[PDB]
Amino acid sequence: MGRGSMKFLFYLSADNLEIARKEVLVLAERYGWVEDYQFEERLLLLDYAGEKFFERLAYTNEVTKIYDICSVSELEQVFSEIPVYDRLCCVRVKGGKGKTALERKLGALLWKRGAKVSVSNPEIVYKVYIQDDKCYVGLLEFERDTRQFFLRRPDRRPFLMPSAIKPKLARALVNLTGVLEGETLLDPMCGTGSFLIEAGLMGINPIGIDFIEKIVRGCRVNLEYYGIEGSVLLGDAKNLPLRDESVRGIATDYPYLRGTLDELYSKTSEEFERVLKKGGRAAIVTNIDVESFFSNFEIEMKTEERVHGSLTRRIYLLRRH
DSSP, X not given: OOOOOEEEEEEEOTTOHHHHHHHHHHHHHHHEEEEEEEEETXXXXXXXXXXXOGGGOSXXXXXXXXXXXXXXXTHHHHHHHSOOOSSOEEEEEESXXXXXXXXXXXXXXXXXXXXXXXXSSOSEEEEEEESSSOEEEEEEEEEOOHHHHHHSSGGGSSSOOTTOOOHHHHHHHHHHTTOOTTSEEEETTXXXXXXXXXXXXXXXXXXXXXXXXXXHHHHHHHXXXXXXOOEEEEOBTTBOSSOTTOEEEEEEEOSTTOOOHHHHHHHHHHHHHHHEEEEEEEEEEESSOOGGGGTTEEEEEEEEXXXXXXXXXXXXXXXXO
């Protein structure tokens, strides 16, 4: 009746390690239960029990279900013991032991044992992660498709804006809000729909609000194009057309590239807090440090992304407390 807790290895994208770790943890804390976790650079080890959510991940490159953790010496014995399945397999090493001779070796151990070994068309992949004579052996559960993100990049969309948020970041920021399938995500300054697109694509109900008519219009054309069903409204993020505690997540990018600064961040901070449900989160993108305006929130994460010489984006994960 209960799912058990197993070790999973998340081989993260070095793009941003704070976003990569917080993304896996927010989703795991929501979909299941995290008995324990630990990280060393690009490797995140999770002790997890619950529904798998790996498909939603943007800043994770691979998820492996761990069978065992051993030394480089014990590798030969692990493979003589590791279960052999009725699927075409291959063994891939994500280590630093020069090259691929270890793969042929572990492949032959599996082969001598009766494994259906195919490196051209495998069905299952035995992953071995080497981080200084420490081997994380298991089976690959997820491998991120970098091609889907490159294809829905703002340049390729019916409509875009200068330096609009890239698919990978928008998805990571919707995931950081911890919003589930069928739950509502609000983007109060939605632009051409970068956040709304990933929200809808991962089966979350998207709501976009924008202060410019042609931008609301353009965002809809993009949503229709990506076969996405969501509502887009003309309104102000400083006076939102939604009731108190009506949204589970906010994911937004402020209009700095297109009253007063003190009014923009103050009125939006209070509106986001008003509109969001109890314990609800806001993943925001600014070009200046806005900490003082969001003291009504818990700053769970502040990271940065240098765009150009005149733009370093600040990325906050805020929570209602």
